[PDB]
Amino acid sequence: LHKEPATLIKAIDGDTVKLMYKGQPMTFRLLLVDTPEFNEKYGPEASAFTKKMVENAKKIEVEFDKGQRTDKYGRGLAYIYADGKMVNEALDRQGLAKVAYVYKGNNTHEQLLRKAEAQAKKEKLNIWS
Numbered sequence: 001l002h003k004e005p006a007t008l009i010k011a012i013d014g015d016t017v018k019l020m021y022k023g024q025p026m027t028f029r030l031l032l033v034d035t036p037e038f039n040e041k042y043g044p045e046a047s048a049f050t051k052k053m054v055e056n057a058k059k060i061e062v063e064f065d066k067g068q069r070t071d072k073y074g075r076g077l078a079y080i081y082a083d084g085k086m087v088n089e090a091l092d093r094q095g096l097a098k099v100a101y102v103y104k105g106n107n108t109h110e111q112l113l114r115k116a117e118a119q120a121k122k123e124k125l126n127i128w129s
């Protein structure tokens with residue numbers, strides 16, 4: 001996989017963010033994770049965590065997997081890095097997201113994210129309280 005530079009437009013919620021990518025606005029849905037909806041428990045906490053992570057990044061990178069690049073709503077499907085730290089993994093590790101929507105094409109970082117989830121689970125963090 002390869003990391004491509006992108007710039008922030010706006011945070012949306014825990015697992016969705018609007019970036020400029022190749023000079024076009026594009027909403028991105030985070031691969032392999034599901035943060036609670038904003039209107040659910042831990043949703044606000046997930047939204048704030050992702051927002052803080054992307055707004056404080058000097059550098060944002062988009063990393064597509066080997067399968068489909070866009071979902072049925074036209075959102076890019078990617079791993080998103082903020083100063084070299086993967087937002088998908090970070091949410092997982094804090095128990096603000098769970099591993100989800102695991103599809104065969106697009107699962108390069110599955111074991112890593114499950115590893116993160118297991119640690120959050122062990123620590124009974126947030127969602128795993």
Ligand SMILES: Cc1cn([C@H]2C[C@H](OP(=O)(O)O)[C@@H](COP(=O)(O)O)O2)c(=O)[nH]c1=O
Nearest residue numbers: 015016029030031032033071072077100101
């Ligand atoms: C992570 C991911 C989500 N999605 C779609 C499935 C869900 O659409 P459906 O609601 O029609 O089932 C949606 C959930 O993400 P959001 O909740 O941010 O919209 O994103 C994919 O299609 N592939 C993916 O890899």
Ligand SMILES: [Ca+2]
Nearest residue numbers: 013014015016
């Ligand atoms: Ca979302």
Ligand SMILES: [Ca+2]
Nearest residue numbers: 034035036037
């Ligand atoms: Ca979600």
